[PDB]
Amino acid sequence: SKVKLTKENIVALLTQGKDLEFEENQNLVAFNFKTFCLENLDQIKKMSIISCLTFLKNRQSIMKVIKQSDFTFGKITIKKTSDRIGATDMTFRRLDSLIRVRLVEETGNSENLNTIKSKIASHPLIQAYGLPLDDAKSVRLAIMLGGSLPLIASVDSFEMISVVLAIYQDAKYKDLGIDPKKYDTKEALGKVCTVLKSKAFEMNEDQVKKGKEYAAILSSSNPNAKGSVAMEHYSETLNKFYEMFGVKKQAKLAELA
Amino acid sequence: SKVKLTKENIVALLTQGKDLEFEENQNLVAFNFKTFCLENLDQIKKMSIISCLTFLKNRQSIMKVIKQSDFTFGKITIKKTSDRIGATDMTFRRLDSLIRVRLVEETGNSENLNTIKSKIASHPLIQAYGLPLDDAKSVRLAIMLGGSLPLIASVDSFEMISVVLAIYQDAKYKDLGIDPKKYDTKEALGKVCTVLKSKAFEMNEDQVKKGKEYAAILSSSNPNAKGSVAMEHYSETLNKFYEMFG
Amino acid sequence: SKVKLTKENIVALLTQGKDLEFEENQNLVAFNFKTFCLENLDQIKKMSIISCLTFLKNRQSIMKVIKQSDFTFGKITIKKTSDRIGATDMTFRRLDSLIRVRLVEETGNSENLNTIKSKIASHPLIQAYGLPLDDAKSVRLAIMLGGSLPLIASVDSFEMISVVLAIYQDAKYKDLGIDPKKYDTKEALGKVCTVLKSKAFEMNEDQVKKGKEYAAILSSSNPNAKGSVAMEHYSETLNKFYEMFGVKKQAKLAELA
């Protein structure tokens, strides 16, 4: 019946009259971060709450260094080769995701919640989002900004905070200064949903209740992306050029004949 | 004076101090696929209908393997990166186009029409477009999806379906998940027209009438390549959150 | 607690329990083209004046060829981006920007200014903008057309000409045939301002007058994009299908009041 996709079978597909079909799956299972998280979370737990927050704050800078070469810390090594990642392999996104899950777990402790709330108010994403940091749910949202939503969504109880944040990022991508060329905000929401359906997640009344509480906090936020702030800083002089680009007539007072 | 636009001439442009200009290269549609198709179609007709559908379904994977080295099947051989293709040479895109032209033929046969309808309903492109596989014209559009529109447009009676699908791809490119960096959707529409103008194709009332029936099917479709199948499942609840953010 | 952001300290961040924060606070953030330009412009200076204009004139054709494989010229190589590009690395846009920067510098030389002026009047972009090309400032604007404004803006003395052209493109995007869906002109102006704000650039009295002289020339140009000839022949019947797909055709108004 169905055969494996090979150079010889493509030749058979094109030169013979036999019905030929290829086996598309080529796998056993899709990647599951919930599983990866249970097996790898303890390893990052010997980190400091402060250090985890430092990782978050200097994400882009830290990522660059990890990307320079095969990054090894302890028993774990983050390979430079982007292609071929095993379900056991550690990538930057997976490291980033583990740390955020760890940070949210720590928000169940009153002391850690206060350290996290104080420190994360200084993070660039939190200020750009204009995120109000009052209660525990808002602090959790703060930890989530910039994280891989489709990965984190697979961890239990992270479903609603992930999908609601994805919706908000889709709706307000312009105000949040998200470049559509670098981050497909619709595709992200799609991947999160794929993850929820894979673990048979049902959005009952209790889950919707949680989500709205998350959504309210996101609504109460005042997004101020770096780009729009940069124009505000120069608006007084930028406007003087907009005026000059108003209506103008060509070849006025030519006086020809 | 003017020189040929090549990789070697570009490195010279960037590394030397000599004055270099590139010759102008208008689109004169040199290669006529209609001619190429008439000469090569009978040979692709020896393939199984199921086999043709298998080709379409696994386009990107089959391409990578064929591109790895000089691929030979029968008397025909697809050379990798010659950089200059004769009107007689076989390329991957030309083979892909032939197979799609062959499949559209078979939609006049009831037995063939239904197997294609049944088989192609599982193709990734058809689902991303959200195309309703109802009638014969709908099945033809399905076979067309992902094909080289400028090439196929030169084949007789394939004009309207090529340009209407091209316009559609330009209008709904965002919903269709077409990356402008990978596929210039405007340039494609232009090429299809350039091809049509070259064969002195005139869009009388009959051509427009046929064209509209294709356009009708495409409007009734619900494109969502970016979206997941799972998105539609939660959609009723997701939208309750959108309203709070609007 | 506070340390220098290094690879060794990241390993410490991830493997130990000590509190670690990165006090670097460099706030360089996005890649800085000013620094890159100083290191590579000298390399682009041995290139023929005529050749630079040829590069601009055949931009997309050259780009496509550059995109085909790892393109190497001299010591420099433009890799095909499987992932992301480093700060020392050469992209096409960076090459394009260097070449454009080199050309405006040449407008300080009277003979080259005349050579550039004669040749660039035939460029597609210049005719589409309907740019007059009288003096040196107009010729600089011509070279600027099609360039990466956020990249070039970081180079000294290029601020005003970059921001003025961006404002113009945002204002007259309709006349220039720019699809808002493919190129967000508001975002572009924002990125340019962001680059300016990252430096201590202030639009003083001297900078604004310089900017206005650029704006005057842009005001005097009358944009009219030609589009494809084969599409104009089929335009009347083509538009019907466009309107079936939710694309209303713009009303052509005589403005006779």
Short mmCIF file of N, CA and C in Angstrom, two decimals, chain A residues 54-165:
data_model
loop_
_atom_site.label_atom_id
_atom_site.label_comp_id
_atom_site.label_asym_id
_atom_site.label_seq_id
_atom_site.Cartn_x
_atom_site.Cartn_y
_atom_site.Cartn_z
N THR A 54 16.53 38.06 36.38
CA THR A 54 17.61 38.63 35.57
C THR A 54 17.59 38.04 34.16
N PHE A 55 17.34 36.74 34.08
CA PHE A 55 17.22 36.05 32.80
C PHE A 55 16.13 36.71 31.96
N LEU A 56 14.98 36.93 32.58
CA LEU A 56 13.84 37.54 31.91
C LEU A 56 14.16 38.94 31.39
N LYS A 57 14.76 39.75 32.26
CA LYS A 57 15.06 41.15 31.98
C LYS A 57 16.09 41.35 30.87
N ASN A 58 17.06 40.45 30.82
CA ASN A 58 18.13 40.54 29.84
C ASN A 58 18.03 39.44 28.80
N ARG A 59 16.79 39.08 28.46
CA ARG A 59 16.52 37.98 27.55
C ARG A 59 17.25 38.09 26.21
N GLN A 60 17.05 39.22 25.53
CA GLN A 60 17.60 39.42 24.20
C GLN A 60 19.13 39.40 24.20
N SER A 61 19.72 39.99 25.23
CA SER A 61 21.17 40.01 25.36
C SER A 61 21.72 38.63 25.70
N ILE A 62 21.06 37.95 26.63
CA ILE A 62 21.47 36.61 27.04
C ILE A 62 21.31 35.61 25.90
N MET A 63 20.22 35.73 25.15
CA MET A 63 19.97 34.86 24.00
C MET A 63 21.13 34.91 23.01
N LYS A 64 21.58 36.12 22.69
CA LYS A 64 22.69 36.33 21.75
C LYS A 64 23.95 35.56 22.14
N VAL A 65 24.29 35.58 23.43
CA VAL A 65 25.47 34.88 23.91
C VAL A 65 25.29 33.37 23.82
N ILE A 66 24.09 32.89 24.14
CA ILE A 66 23.80 31.46 24.04
C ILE A 66 23.93 31.01 22.59
N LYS A 67 23.56 31.90 21.68
CA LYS A 67 23.60 31.62 20.24
C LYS A 67 24.99 31.67 19.60
N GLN A 68 25.96 32.28 20.27
CA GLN A 68 27.29 32.43 19.68
C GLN A 68 27.96 31.09 19.40
N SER A 69 27.83 30.16 20.34
CA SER A 69 28.42 28.83 20.20
C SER A 69 27.64 27.82 21.02
N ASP A 70 28.02 26.55 20.91
CA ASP A 70 27.41 25.50 21.72
C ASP A 70 27.51 25.88 23.19
N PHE A 71 26.37 26.24 23.77
CA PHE A 71 26.36 26.74 25.14
C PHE A 71 26.15 25.61 26.12
N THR A 72 27.12 25.44 27.01
CA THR A 72 27.07 24.38 28.00
C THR A 72 27.08 24.95 29.41
N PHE A 73 26.11 24.53 30.21
CA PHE A 73 26.05 24.88 31.61
C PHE A 73 25.64 23.63 32.38
N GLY A 74 26.51 23.19 33.28
CA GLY A 74 26.28 21.95 34.00
C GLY A 74 26.27 20.74 33.08
N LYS A 75 25.27 19.88 33.26
CA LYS A 75 25.11 18.67 32.45
C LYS A 75 24.43 18.98 31.12
N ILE A 76 23.80 20.15 31.04
CA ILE A 76 22.99 20.52 29.89
C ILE A 76 23.74 21.38 28.88
N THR A 77 23.52 21.13 27.60
CA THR A 77 24.15 21.91 26.54
C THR A 77 23.13 22.33 25.48
N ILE A 78 23.08 23.63 25.19
CA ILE A 78 22.20 24.17 24.16
C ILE A 78 22.97 24.29 22.85
N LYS A 79 22.67 23.39 21.92
CA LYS A 79 23.38 23.31 20.66
C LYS A 79 23.07 24.47 19.72
N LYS A 80 24.07 24.83 18.92
CA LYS A 80 24.01 25.91 17.94
C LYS A 80 23.16 25.50 16.74
N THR A 81 23.25 24.23 16.38
CA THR A 81 22.46 23.63 15.31
C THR A 81 20.96 23.76 15.60
N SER A 82 20.29 24.68 14.91
CA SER A 82 18.85 24.84 15.07
C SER A 82 18.04 23.65 14.57
N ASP A 83 18.48 23.00 13.49
CA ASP A 83 17.74 21.86 12.97
C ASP A 83 17.95 20.62 13.83
N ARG A 84 17.00 19.69 13.73
CA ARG A 84 17.04 18.43 14.46
C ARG A 84 17.09 18.58 15.98
N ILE A 85 15.99 18.97 16.60
CA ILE A 85 15.99 19.02 18.06
C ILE A 85 15.14 17.87 18.56
N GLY A 86 15.72 17.07 19.46
CA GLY A 86 15.01 15.96 20.05
C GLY A 86 14.10 16.42 21.16
N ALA A 87 13.16 15.56 21.55
CA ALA A 87 12.20 15.90 22.58
C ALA A 87 12.89 16.08 23.93
N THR A 88 14.12 15.58 24.02
CA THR A 88 14.91 15.67 25.24
C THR A 88 15.88 16.84 25.14
N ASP A 89 16.13 17.30 23.92
CA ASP A 89 17.10 18.37 23.69
C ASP A 89 16.64 19.70 24.29
N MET A 90 17.61 20.50 24.72
CA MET A 90 17.33 21.80 25.32
C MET A 90 17.63 22.94 24.35
N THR A 91 16.62 23.74 24.06
CA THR A 91 16.78 24.94 23.25
C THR A 91 16.67 26.16 24.15
N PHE A 92 16.92 27.35 23.60
CA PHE A 92 16.78 28.57 24.38
C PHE A 92 15.33 28.81 24.80
N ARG A 93 14.39 28.63 23.87
CA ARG A 93 12.97 28.85 24.15
C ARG A 93 12.50 27.94 25.28
N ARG A 94 13.01 26.71 25.27
CA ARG A 94 12.66 25.73 26.28
C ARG A 94 13.27 26.10 27.63
N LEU A 95 14.48 26.64 27.62
CA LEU A 95 15.09 27.13 28.85
C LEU A 95 14.30 28.32 29.38
N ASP A 96 13.99 29.24 28.48
CA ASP A 96 13.20 30.42 28.79
C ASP A 96 11.84 30.04 29.38
N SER A 97 11.21 29.03 28.78
CA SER A 97 9.90 28.57 29.23
C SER A 97 9.94 27.88 30.60
N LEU A 98 10.95 27.05 30.83
CA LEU A 98 11.12 26.41 32.13
C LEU A 98 11.21 27.43 33.25
N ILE A 99 11.98 28.49 33.02
CA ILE A 99 12.21 29.52 34.02
C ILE A 99 10.93 30.29 34.36
N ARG A 100 10.12 30.57 33.35
CA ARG A 100 8.86 31.27 33.55
C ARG A 100 7.86 30.41 34.33
N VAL A 101 7.81 29.13 34.01
CA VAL A 101 6.97 28.19 34.76
C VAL A 101 7.43 28.15 36.22
N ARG A 102 8.74 28.11 36.41
CA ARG A 102 9.32 28.14 37.75
C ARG A 102 8.92 29.41 38.50
N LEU A 103 8.98 30.55 37.82
CA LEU A 103 8.67 31.83 38.45
C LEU A 103 7.20 31.91 38.88
N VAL A 104 6.30 31.42 38.03
CA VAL A 104 4.88 31.41 38.35
C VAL A 104 4.59 30.51 39.55
N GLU A 105 5.26 29.37 39.61
CA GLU A 105 5.15 28.46 40.75
C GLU A 105 5.52 29.17 42.05
N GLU A 106 6.53 30.03 41.99
CA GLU A 106 7.01 30.74 43.17
C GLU A 106 6.04 31.83 43.63
N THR A 107 5.06 32.17 42.80
CA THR A 107 4.09 33.19 43.14
C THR A 107 3.02 32.64 44.08
N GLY A 108 3.19 31.38 44.47
CA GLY A 108 2.31 30.76 45.45
C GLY A 108 2.85 31.00 46.84
N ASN A 109 4.06 31.53 46.91
CA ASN A 109 4.69 31.90 48.17
C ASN A 109 4.67 33.42 48.35
N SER A 110 4.21 33.87 49.52
CA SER A 110 3.99 35.29 49.76
C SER A 110 5.26 36.14 49.65
N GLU A 111 6.37 35.61 50.16
CA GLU A 111 7.64 36.35 50.14
C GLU A 111 8.19 36.49 48.73
N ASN A 112 8.17 35.38 47.99
CA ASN A 112 8.65 35.37 46.62
C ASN A 112 7.81 36.28 45.74
N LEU A 113 6.50 36.29 45.98
CA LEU A 113 5.58 37.16 45.24
C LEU A 113 5.99 38.62 45.37
N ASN A 114 6.43 39.02 46.56
CA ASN A 114 6.81 40.41 46.79
C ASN A 114 8.14 40.76 46.13
N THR A 115 9.08 39.82 46.12
CA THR A 115 10.34 40.05 45.44
C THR A 115 10.13 40.16 43.93
N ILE A 116 9.32 39.25 43.39
CA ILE A 116 9.01 39.24 41.96
C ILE A 116 8.27 40.50 41.52
N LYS A 117 7.25 40.89 42.29
CA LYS A 117 6.49 42.10 42.00
C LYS A 117 7.37 43.36 41.96
N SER A 118 8.27 43.49 42.93
CA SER A 118 9.16 44.64 43.01
C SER A 118 10.16 44.68 41.86
N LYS A 119 10.74 43.52 41.55
CA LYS A 119 11.80 43.44 40.55
C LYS A 119 11.28 43.56 39.12
N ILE A 120 10.15 42.93 38.84
CA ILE A 120 9.65 42.83 37.47
C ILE A 120 8.98 44.12 36.99
N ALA A 121 8.75 45.06 37.91
CA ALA A 121 8.17 46.35 37.55
C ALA A 121 9.17 47.18 36.75
N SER A 122 10.42 46.75 36.76
CA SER A 122 11.50 47.47 36.10
C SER A 122 11.84 46.87 34.74
N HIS A 123 11.22 45.74 34.43
CA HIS A 123 11.44 45.05 33.15
C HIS A 123 10.84 45.81 31.97
N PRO A 124 11.57 45.84 30.84
CA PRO A 124 11.16 46.59 29.65
C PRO A 124 9.79 46.19 29.09
N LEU A 125 9.49 44.89 29.02
CA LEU A 125 8.20 44.45 28.49
C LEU A 125 7.04 44.91 29.36
N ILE A 126 7.25 44.93 30.67
CA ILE A 126 6.19 45.31 31.60
C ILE A 126 5.87 46.80 31.46
N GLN A 127 6.90 47.62 31.29
CA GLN A 127 6.71 49.05 31.10
C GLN A 127 6.12 49.37 29.72
N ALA A 128 6.56 48.64 28.70
CA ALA A 128 6.05 48.84 27.34
C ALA A 128 4.58 48.45 27.25
N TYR A 129 4.21 47.43 28.02
CA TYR A 129 2.83 46.97 28.06
C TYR A 129 1.98 47.89 28.93
N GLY A 130 2.63 48.62 29.82
CA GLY A 130 1.94 49.48 30.76
C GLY A 130 1.09 48.62 31.66
N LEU A 131 1.67 47.51 32.11
CA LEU A 131 0.92 46.52 32.87
C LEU A 131 0.83 46.89 34.33
N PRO A 132 -0.40 47.00 34.85
CA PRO A 132 -0.60 47.30 36.26
C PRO A 132 -0.22 46.09 37.10
N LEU A 133 0.61 46.29 38.11
CA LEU A 133 1.08 45.19 38.93
C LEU A 133 0.49 45.25 40.33
N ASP A 134 -0.79 44.95 40.45
CA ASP A 134 -1.45 44.99 41.75
C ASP A 134 -1.48 43.62 42.42
N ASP A 135 -2.26 42.69 41.87
CA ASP A 135 -2.46 41.41 42.54
C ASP A 135 -1.63 40.28 41.94
N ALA A 136 -1.87 39.07 42.43
CA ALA A 136 -1.10 37.89 42.03
C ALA A 136 -1.26 37.53 40.56
N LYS A 137 -2.47 37.67 40.03
CA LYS A 137 -2.73 37.31 38.64
C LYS A 137 -1.98 38.24 37.68
N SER A 138 -1.87 39.51 38.06
CA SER A 138 -1.14 40.47 37.25
C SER A 138 0.36 40.17 37.27
N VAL A 139 0.86 39.75 38.42
CA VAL A 139 2.28 39.41 38.55
C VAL A 139 2.61 38.20 37.69
N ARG A 140 1.68 37.25 37.63
CA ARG A 140 1.84 36.08 36.78
C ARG A 140 1.85 36.49 35.32
N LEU A 141 0.94 37.39 34.94
CA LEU A 141 0.91 37.92 33.59
C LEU A 141 2.23 38.58 33.24
N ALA A 142 2.81 39.27 34.22
CA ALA A 142 4.08 39.96 34.02
C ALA A 142 5.19 38.98 33.65
N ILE A 143 5.24 37.85 34.36
CA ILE A 143 6.21 36.81 34.10
C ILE A 143 6.02 36.22 32.70
N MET A 144 4.78 36.25 32.21
CA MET A 144 4.44 35.62 30.94
C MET A 144 4.85 36.42 29.71
N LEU A 145 4.81 37.75 29.80
CA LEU A 145 5.20 38.63 28.69
C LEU A 145 6.56 38.29 28.10
N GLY A 146 6.56 37.96 26.81
CA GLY A 146 7.78 37.62 26.09
C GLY A 146 8.08 36.13 26.07
N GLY A 147 7.28 35.36 26.79
CA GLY A 147 7.47 33.92 26.84
C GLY A 147 6.85 33.22 25.65
N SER A 148 7.29 31.99 25.39
CA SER A 148 6.72 31.19 24.32
C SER A 148 5.36 30.66 24.75
N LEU A 149 4.30 31.33 24.30
CA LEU A 149 2.95 30.95 24.69
C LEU A 149 2.56 29.52 24.28
N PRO A 150 2.89 29.09 23.04
CA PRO A 150 2.49 27.71 22.70
C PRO A 150 3.16 26.64 23.56
N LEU A 151 4.39 26.88 24.01
CA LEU A 151 5.07 25.92 24.88
C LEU A 151 4.43 25.89 26.27
N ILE A 152 4.28 27.07 26.86
CA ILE A 152 3.80 27.20 28.23
C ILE A 152 2.35 26.74 28.37
N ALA A 153 1.58 26.90 27.30
CA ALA A 153 0.17 26.52 27.31
C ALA A 153 -0.07 25.03 27.61
N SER A 154 0.93 24.19 27.35
CA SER A 154 0.77 22.75 27.56
C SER A 154 0.89 22.35 29.03
N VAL A 155 1.53 23.20 29.82
CA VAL A 155 1.64 22.96 31.25
C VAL A 155 0.28 23.21 31.90
N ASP A 156 -0.14 22.30 32.78
CA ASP A 156 -1.47 22.38 33.39
C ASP A 156 -1.70 23.68 34.15
N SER A 157 -2.92 24.21 34.00
CA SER A 157 -3.40 25.46 34.60
C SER A 157 -2.81 26.71 33.94
N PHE A 158 -1.99 26.52 32.91
CA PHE A 158 -1.41 27.65 32.19
C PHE A 158 -2.17 27.95 30.91
N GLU A 159 -3.25 27.21 30.69
CA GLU A 159 -4.00 27.31 29.44
C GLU A 159 -4.60 28.69 29.24
N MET A 160 -5.42 29.12 30.19
CA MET A 160 -6.17 30.37 30.03
C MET A 160 -5.28 31.61 30.03
N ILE A 161 -4.27 31.64 30.90
CA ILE A 161 -3.38 32.80 30.94
C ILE A 161 -2.61 32.90 29.63
N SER A 162 -2.37 31.76 28.99
CA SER A 162 -1.67 31.72 27.71
C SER A 162 -2.53 32.18 26.54
N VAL A 163 -3.75 31.66 26.46
CA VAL A 163 -4.61 31.94 25.31
C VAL A 163 -5.16 33.37 25.39
N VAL A 164 -5.44 33.85 26.60
CA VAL A 164 -5.96 35.20 26.77
C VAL A 164 -4.89 36.21 26.39
N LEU A 165 -3.66 35.94 26.80
CA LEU A 165 -2.54 36.81 26.46
C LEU A 165 -2.27 36.78 24.96
#
